[PDB]
Amino acid sequence: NADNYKNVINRTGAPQYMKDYDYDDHQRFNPFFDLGAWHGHLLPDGPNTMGGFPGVALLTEEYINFMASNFDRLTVWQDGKKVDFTLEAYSIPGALVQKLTAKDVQVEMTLRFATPRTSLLETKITSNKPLDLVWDGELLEKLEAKEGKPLSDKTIAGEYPDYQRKISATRDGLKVTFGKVRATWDLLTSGESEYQVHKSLPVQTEINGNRFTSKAHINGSTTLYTTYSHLLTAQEVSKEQMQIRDILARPAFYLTASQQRWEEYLKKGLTNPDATPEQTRVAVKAIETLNGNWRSPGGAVKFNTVTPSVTGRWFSGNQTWPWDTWKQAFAMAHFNPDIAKENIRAVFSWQIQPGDSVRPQDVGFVPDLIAWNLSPERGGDGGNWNERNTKPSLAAWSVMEVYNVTQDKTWVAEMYPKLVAYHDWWLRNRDHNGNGVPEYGATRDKAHNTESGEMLFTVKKGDKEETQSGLNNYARVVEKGQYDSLEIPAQVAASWESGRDDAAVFGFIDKEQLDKYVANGGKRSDWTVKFAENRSQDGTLLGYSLLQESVDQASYMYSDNHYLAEMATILGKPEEAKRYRQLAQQLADYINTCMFDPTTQFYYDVRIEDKPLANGCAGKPIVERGKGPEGWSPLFNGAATQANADAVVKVMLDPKEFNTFVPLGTAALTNPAFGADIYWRGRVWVDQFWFGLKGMERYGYRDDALKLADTFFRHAKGLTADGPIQANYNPLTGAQQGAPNFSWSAAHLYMLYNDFFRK
Template identity: 50%
Template structure:
C-alpha cells in the first residue's frame, strides 16, 4: 500500500506531467491534453462491473439487480463491462446499459457501440481485456497483427456519459468500422433463468422502444409512456440518445442498430450516451452534448480529476491494511454510484439507498439513510453531502401546509421525483403526481444535527471552506430546530420531554370519508367505520379470517381482552418504520402460530420453530404442542396450517399472558384544539432518547457556532436532563442492559414513565447510549459484557439486531437477527467510547473477515447473517458503505 503522503505528491506531479504530454492523435479535437488517473489506477476491479443483460429485469438474491453497473455524477443511466466468461456471447467491446426509469433501475441494452472491424474482407479477431477503475470502464481489444481498439467510458454530466474510442491501425489500410447496439428483449429473469416469462413487448405493451437515426448516423431510443408497472415507469418523453463525433451510415431494426464508418490510419472519436426523462431535459442537455463533443478531452480530464480528488480526500488513513483501503474505495464508489441529480419534483442532488435495489433506486430519499450517507461523504464529496441533506428538507412541512398543517417541522419518510397522490392533489400537481414510494406516514430518528455538524467540520477542517461551512450551519439551523420541536409536539404524549416513535395522522392510518361511505370490497375494508378513526385488523380466536375495525380505544381494548390470534395496525407498521428498525422485537414483533402456514409440507418441529410466541409462552406454563393440518380450498390448493393441540381456556390464559407482554398500545397526540396530530407507541425508546440526547448536544454546538448562545445553553440543559433520564429509567441492573420502557397510565415514583421492557430481549437499542455518549461508565461496562457474550451478540459476524437468546431472534429475520452495518458501527463506536477499543477492533476485524464478499469484488450489502456471514438484503447499499467508510476513516488503526 502506498503511503498517502506519497500518493498526494505523486498525484500532483503526475497530473502536471500528463497535462504536458501529447496524447493520442485526435482528429476531432485540437485540445489533446488529458490527465491520467493515478490514484484510481491502483484500484482496478474493486467491484465486479461485468454483465450481459438480456431482460428488462435481471435479478439475483432478494429480487435486486443481478449486476453492479457503473453509475456516476448523478446520471440516470449506468454501464456494464461485457461478461467475457459467457463464451457464447460475442459482446466484447460493447457496454451493457441500464436506465433508471424514474423509480426503478432496469436493463435497456445488451450492449451499445460494440465495435467490429473488417480488414481485407475479413472480420478482425480480437483478444479483449476489460476492467474497471473508480470512475471508469476500460476495454482494450487487440489482434495478433497489432490492430488495437482502446475504449474508455466515463460520466461527464448529470445526464451523459462519454466513450472515447481509439483505433490504432498500424497497417494504414482502409478499415470498415462497425458500431452496433442491441436492446434487451426479455422481461424478467432470476439468476439467469427466464422462467417461461413473456417477452418485454408482451408484458409491457405501452413500454415501446422506438429507434430512430439522423442524417449523420446518431441514434435515439424513444420510450413509450408506462405508469402502471412496478418495474419501469416512463413519461412518454424519456429517451436515450447516442451522439457521435464522427458521421456514420446507420441502419436500424426494431431492436438494434448498426453504424458503419470507413477509416484509414489511426482515429480517435467520441460517443455521448444521454438518458433524459422529459423532453425539457433533452432540450437542456443537447447543448451540453454539443459542448462535450466540441471539447471531449476537457470533459474526460474533469472526470479523471474529480475521481482523483475523491480518492485523495477520502483515503486519509495511512495505517490500515490493504483490504481495509480497498473496502474504503468500494464504499466511495458505492456512495457516488447511488448519487442522483435533480429530477421531477425533487430540486436537489441526493443519494439513494441503492441504485440496484428494486425499492431503493431513482432519487428516492430517506432521512435515516441521509444522515449516515452525508456524514461519510462529507469527507470526500461534501457538495453532494450537503445536497443530500437539502433534499430531505425540501419538503419539510411548513406553517399552513396544504396537506398536513398540523405537522409543522415534520420531515417526510420518503421523497423522490414523483409526489404521492394525496400531496399532489393538495398542491394541484399536474405532472410527477403518482409516486409509488413517496411516504408521509412517519419520519426517521433525529440524527440530523449529528450529520450537519460533521459536514460543517469537514468543510472547515479538511476542505478549507470555512465560509461555506458557517453558511451551511446558518442555512440548516432553523430547519433543524423546527424538526426538533416537531418531535415534542407530535411524539411526546406524556409531555416529559422524551419523544416516542409513532405514526402520522394519515389516510393510510385513519378511515377517510370516502372509505367509510364506499361499499366493502377487495380494495376497501372500512365501510361504515368512524371517519378519522385509527385503522386496525385482527383474527378472532377460533377464526382464520381478518376482521377490520377502527378506533384507538377499540384497538387498545382488544389488546386487553386478548380475544385475537393475530392483530395488526398500519400505524404500528409506520411506527416501526419511524425507528429505522422495521420489525424489531422491541416494538412487539414476534412470529406467531398464524405465521406457521405454508403451501410446502411443514413438520411439527418446523411449525414450532416458526411459532416464537408459543415457545416464549412456555415460561408461563403454556402447552405449545402443535398439530399441522392439510387444508384444501375451493380451488383445490393445498395449504399446511398449524394449530395448537391444547385449546382449553386454561391453556389459552397462559398464552394470553405472553401476548400481553408483546402487545404495543397506542396513544394519540393532540394539539391545543384537541385535533389529533399523530400517534405514539405507549413506550419510550432508548435509542430515540439517545439520539435525542445527541440532537440536543449538536444543536447546542451549532447554535454556539453561529452566535445563538442562549439557545446553546437551553439545548445543553435538555441534553443533560435526557442523559439522567436514560440512566435512571432505561437501564436494567439485573441484566446489565438498556431497554425501551413502557408508558404507564401513571408515572413511577422516581419520575420514569414505566418499567424496562426486558422480556422482549436485547437488541442494538441497548448500546445506543454508548454510541451517543449518554451512558455512565458503570452501565457501559455491563452493556459491553453482554455485547461480548457468545450466547448473545458475539457471533461469526458480531452484533446482530437481536441477541441469540432473544425470544424473537432469527438469523434471517430483517431486524431481529441480521447484522446491519450501521448498528454494528454504533456498537463498536460505543465500545471504544467507553474504553473497549481492543475488543471493538477485534469485532471490526471479524466483520471484514467474515462478511461474505466484503473484501472481494462483491457489492456492499444491506445486511449479513450473524451466524454464517452470508449476504442478505439489498446490494450496493449506501448506509452500509457509509459506516464501512467511517470505520476506515476514523476508527481502524
C-alpha cells in the first residue's frame, strides 16, 4: 500500500528562479515526475502556495528549468467571503496529495500522471453551499539563484530575448507558449513547445501580462479534473489532444491505472519485508528516484530511458550513459522491467553501424552520452552528446537479468546481435596487441587528435603551457621529463571509458602526492601513462589504447562472454555459445595468471610492456599505483579462483586498506593517490560497494559482507533522512557528495536492501 510510505523524499518547495540552485548547481527541490513525463510538480509548504502544486518544473530537452512559483493555485469564496483553509500535504509513491480543510468547505487534491506528457489533477470539493472558485498563476521572472541568494539582477526574458513566453486562453483552460531558444548549456526549446491546462468544467480566464486568473462557479460538492501537459514539439501538441480528451472523459480509469502500476512496483519491489522500517523506506526512496528519472522518448532518443538525475545540472533531460543504464536496468528488472528493457534499447539505438557518417571505423561502438540533440558533427546543436569513449561491458549482465525475470525469448533475440557487435568492437578497436584482453582508450575524435591523425597533448611548466601533437613526440617528451605536468585528452577519455574519471591506475595523481611517492623511493616514471594508436592493416586509424589492460574490464568482459553464451544457447546457436565460453575461460586464465599479484594479495591492471613476459602476459601488474575497487572485479564477475578470492577478501576487510568508516571506497588508504574528497580516488560509491559484497558472497563470505552492509547502513550519512539520494561518500566521515536523485545509487541501494540490509 503506497499510503504506508508518505514523504519518503521531501518534495516541498516554492521556487522563485528558473535556475533555483543548490551549491553544486542542482535544482534544490525534488519535483514528482512519472511515466516518462517531461514536467514535474512540487508540494506546497505554507499558506502562500496552499491550493496549488508550486514549481512547475519543465524538462527543456536536456535541462531542468522551473516555469512558475504558483500556477493554477486554487482559492475559494463563499458569497464574497474568502475560505480560510489549513493545509495537509504529502507525497506517496506515485502521487502528490494535498488537503485543504475549513469549517464548511474541504478540498482534496490528488496529482498523478496519465500519459508520457500529461499529469492529471483531481480536485474533490466538499461543500453544502455554492462556491466561487478562483485559480491564479504567474510565470517566473528571475533567472538564477544559489541557495536562495540571487546571483544577479538578471531576468529570464533579458537573458533569453527569443523565449517570448505568452499565456493564451482556450475553450477548456489555458496554455503557455515558448519561443525557440538554443542555449546549449541552459535552455533548449523548439519554438513549438507548450504547457497546456485543460479542465473538465467551463472556466472564464482573464490574462494580464504574464499572469492569469480563471473563475468558475459550482453549485456544491463536486469533483473536477485538470490535465497539465508539457509538449515539446508541434507533433506532440497535436497528438496529445485526443489523449487529453479521453482523460477528461474517463479520469477514474487513469487514476486507477497509476494507482495499480505503483502497487505493482511496491509488491514486486519490496521482497524483504523483515528489513527494518527505515531500511524499507530506503528501498521505496530508491524506487521513487529511479521512476522519477525515467523519460519517455524525446528528440533523437526514440525509446524510454533513465538518466542519472532529473534535478541534476548535467544529468537531466533524457541524457543517457551506458554503464548507468546497465546498473539501472539490472535493478529495475525487479520492479519495472518494461522500462528496464527500454533503457537498454535507448543506449543501443545509437550503436555505430557500417557506413556511419562520422566514425565508420567504430562499427559496434556504443556512445558514452546520448540525448535529445545530436552533436554538430551529426547535424544537431547539442553540446552533451559524446562519442570520445564508451563505458565498461555490463550490457549482457543487464540484458540477462531482464530475461531471467521476464522469460521473454524475443528479448534475447532482440539484444543478442547488438551485444555481439559491441563485443567485437572492443576486440577490434581496444586490443592493440591482439591478445584478446582489452585496453581502455579513446576514439578518433576532434578532442583527441589533429585532422591528420596525431594525438594531442599539452605540456605544462610553471605558467607556461604548450599544446603539441604526435605519439612519437609524446614518447620523446615523456622520456625527457622536462615538464611539471601533462594533460592528455586521450587519457581523460580512457578514464571516462572505465567510468572512474581520473582514477589512480590511469596515471592520475596530484603533484604534492607525487612528490611524497618519490621522496619515499618511488620513480616518477611509474605514474607516466603510455599510449598506442590502433590501426587496421590498410593503415586506417581506429583509435587509441592506453598501453595497459584493465582488470575491471577484463573481468566484466569475462562475465559478459558467459551471459552471451547463455543467450546463444537460448537462441539455438551452440557453436557461438561454445566460442563465448572458450573466450571467457581464456580471460579467466589471463586475469588470474597476469593481473593477480600473490605478494600484495590483490588484482591490478597490467602494463603492455615492450615485449610480453615469458608466461605470455603483456606485462606486470601495476602494483605501484595502488589498490582500487577494480581489484575485486574478478570476484564480482566470477573470474577469480577461490584461492585468489580468499586473498582479496582479506585485503578488503583490512582497516588499513578498504575496511573504513564507510568501507570499500574507490582507492585504498594505502594508495599513493588517495584523497577522501576525490570522487574516484577514495570516495565510496554504492555500485562498487555492492559489486564488492556480491563478489564476497559468491566466494563464500556472505557473513562478512552482511557486516560491511550493516556498517554502511549505520555510517552512511543521510540514509534514514528524507533527502534525495546522492552519488558518493567520504570513506572516513561518511559525508555525502554528488548529484541529488542519483540513479545508480538508488539502483544499488535498492539491491542492497534486497540482498544485504537486515535488522
